[PDB]
Write a protein that binds this ligand. Sequence first.
Ligand SMILES: BrCc1cccc(I)c1
Length: 215
Amino acid sequence: DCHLSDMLQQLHSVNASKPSERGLVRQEEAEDPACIPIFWVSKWVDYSDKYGLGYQLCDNSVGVLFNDSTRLILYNDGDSLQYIERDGTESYLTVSSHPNSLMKKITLLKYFRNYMSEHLLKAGANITRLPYLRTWFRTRSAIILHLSNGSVQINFFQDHTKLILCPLMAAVTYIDEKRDFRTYRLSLLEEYGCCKELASRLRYARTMVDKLLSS
Ligand SMILES: BrCc1cccc(I)c1
């Protein structure tokens, strides 16, 4: 299930502990820099009416989830490709080899790359295996991005805040409006509690991970 069940369990636990009602809140105490995620989606472009969803990961790699549920990933070296059919079957290729099979999808991918590079701002710019985008959807309030390493990222439209959930670390990273990165250990959030806004977004995240599992 790509650790969705695990993540669901970790969020029910933090939310059940009602961490914004704790009298003596020390959210600063729940931080843990040995849980900082390796990957997250730094930019994305929804062209899903026509071709699909383009994105860039923080390592500068660029991927597309095409409508046919195939994925093409261009590594940060500008040439090496990874290709995933619906089957999940992976294969590796290079741009320079010019594979006749994927000419069209390469061109599309380069368009997405071009657009993102010139027109979009990076997420989490001022801080320091290659997964692909498994699934995604968006509500009025947010886009939800589920990576194949189990990570779930939720980007909120209103205020530009972002959640990155890592079930393997049982951790949450929170990017605020001021672009500040903070990484928390979920269990420690139950103990030290947190602010009302991190709290409501974790309630929203549990509902969103529910939604992923009903599909
Ligand atoms: Br219709 C040209 C095109 C294709 C893929 C992505 C983008 I952004 C634009």
